[PDB]
Design a binder for this molecule. Structure first.
Ligand SMILES: Nc1nc2c(ncn2[C@@H]2O[C@@H]3COP(=O)(O)O[C@H]4[C@@H](O)[C@H](n5cnc6c(=O)[nH]c(N)nc65)O[C@@H]4COP(=O)(O)O[C@H]3[C@H]2O)c(=O)[nH]1
Ligand SMILES: Nc1nc2c(ncn2[C@@H]2O[C@@H]3COP(=O)(O)O[C@H]4[C@@H](O)[C@H](n5cnc6c(=O)[nH]c(N)nc65)O[C@@H]4COP(=O)(O)O[C@H]3[C@H]2O)c(=O)[nH]1
Lengths: 181, 181
């Protein structure tokens, strides 16, 4: 009985399933983004092991060297779920310094369902202990992997990024951007 | 291992936990709503047994006699989750005919996590059969009841409304509005 399973299926069907196949095309709608080299087009989904964040990524405790900068948003994608509610999905583009080289552009986002794990652990510790929360993060990670890997339209469109609150996200992102296709 | 459990906890922590305690007060910000009698202030959360809806409630297959009318929206509530994302929550007010009497106003909303159950059953039948979906609706209902009933701030602020696709929502709502305190 894993609360993370529902969190992963809902993250997919209520969001990723339709934003991931279109992400590259949405990005391509902006001339600046068409012109930019070193712009990896995958959604980097951030999964901090403590299920927590409280600020903008640039200059945050995860960016101690201040190497991450908000660049702008992608062109909104429209989607209608249920038949009644029109929703607009857009993503934040960040610039990540690469020493004296050309800086990278990338798409980064926290996995928002992790806030529920965090909220649960604080408001209902009897339901989710700290150690049970740690474990549900892993369950969440593995299930989301299975779901996304089972969808051919999502192949190559994302990368899950797990890290400890002590890690430097700029360092983590630089390695993942360099290793991207 | 019930996918519905995760769906219910996130529906709560990502939405209901903060909209339900404030709903009556948000409604009271509009003079028309302060002036209106027979305006039950609870959120009526709609849980169709088939996990499905494809249109506006007024005049829908659930409103065969056309007794439900969209009246307007509540004043948005602002909330910041994560520290980074400002969100605006608002709700639809509907008028429901009561014969020759003064019509009711009420707040009605489909439980959006049910779409994930629906989407799963159609896209991944191997993961969720039709009969398994039926069962997850019941699990979802009972878990959401436990969660909401455990939060004193949500007491008296909602009502879960379960119905078959053959039911007349206007009749169902009328009985529940008359039975409200
Ligand atoms: N980083 C981040 N960004 C998010 C998130 N959710 C929405 N956004 C984005 O923020 C924009 C405005 O959010 P809003 O102020 O709450 O204002 C929203 C909200 O009041 C409402 N809304 C949002 N989700 C739902 C839903 O599931 N059902 C219904 N009935 N209304 C919704 O419609 C308004 C506009 O919707 P959108 O066009 O899609 O535009 C959304 C959407 O592009 C999130 O969880 N994380
Ligand atoms: N970055 C980003 N992620 C998105 C966006 N839309 C959906 N997601 C992700 O998909 C998850 C589940 O979306 P949901 O099925 O609509 O299921 C939601 C929905 O049923 C309900 N909910 C949340 N916000 C609203 C709202 O504004 N209006 C209504 N009617 N329901 C809402 O709470 C459920 C869980 O909410 P979450 O914890 O936020 O979890 C969200 C969120 O993690 C988005 O625009 N931007």
């Amino acid at each position: 009985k894993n609360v993370a399973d529902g969190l992963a299926w809902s993250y997919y069907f209520g969001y990723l399933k339709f934003v991931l196949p279109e992400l590259e095309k949405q990005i391509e709608k902006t001339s600046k983004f068409r012109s930019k080299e070193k712009f990896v087009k995958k959604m980097f989904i951030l999964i901090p092991s403590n299920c927590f964040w409280d600020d903008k990524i640039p200059g945050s405790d995860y960016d101690p060297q201040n190497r991450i900068t908000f660049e702008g948003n992608t062109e909104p994608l429209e989607k209608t779920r249920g038949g009644v509610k029109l929703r607009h999905y857009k993503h934040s583009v960040y610039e990540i310094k690469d020493g004296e080289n050309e800086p990278w552009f990338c798409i980064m986002e926290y996995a928002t369902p992790l806030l529920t794990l965090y909220d649960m652990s604080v408001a209902q510790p009897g339901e989710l202990s700290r150690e049970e929360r740690d474990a549900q993060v892993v369950v969440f990670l593995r299930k989301l992997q299975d779901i996304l890997e089972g969808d051919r339209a999502c192949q190559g469109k994302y990368e899950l990024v797990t890290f400890s609150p002590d890690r430097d996200l700029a360092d983590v992102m630089l390695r993942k951007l360099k290793d991207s296709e």
